[PDB]
């Protein structure tokens with residue numbers, strides 16, 4: 001009775017094992033999942049859009065109902081362009097929860113069709129974020145346990161080509 005299409009928006013800078021778990025859980029519950037990678041013009045991602053899309057496709061491309069798209073502008077305009085049923089967000093901590101509550105209500109005011117659904121991480125990924133991973137990698141820590149092997153290699157090639 002109409003295919004469901006959920007957008008999963010994020011910087012994915014880089015994708016972690018926690019994002020992989022979330023997308024895999026979502027792909028079991030909706031007909032289509034869009035991994036929506038916010039380009040970040042007036043922000044400053046460590047990995048380019050192309051690197052972030054490739055790392056995501058390497059980790060999640062084996063899931064046949066998952067698409068990978070870069071976007072910018074208002075999430076609600078992307079939501080309407082994509083004809084989404086909902087946006088999906090992971091909730092890791094309390095400040096995540098308060099911020100996401102506020103955004104969902106603001107977006108519902110911009111577009112009354114907007115919907116947001118939330119997943120909580122399995123406890124083995126609950127302490128992982130892209131920001132903390134970037135920090136351990138930058139200080140030459142081993143991030144192998146928190147991210148796909150392709151991301152581990154991308155941090156070496158970020159190093160080698162600079163860093």
Ligand SMILES: O=C1O[C@H]([C@@H](O)CO)C(O)=C1O
Pocket residue numbers: 009010011012013016018019128129130131
């Ligand atoms: O894709 C993202 O990286 C961070 C981080 O929380 C992941 O744990 C986040 O929320 C994104 O949008």
Ligand SMILES: O=C1O[C@H]([C@@H](O)CO)C(O)=C1O
Pocket residue numbers: 017059144145146147148149150
């Ligand atoms: O070799 C691998 O390990 C990573 C990660 O899943 C473990 O942190 C990954 O994607 C592989 O395929």
Ligand code: NA
Pocket residue numbers: 018021022120121122123125
């Ligand atoms: Na999880």
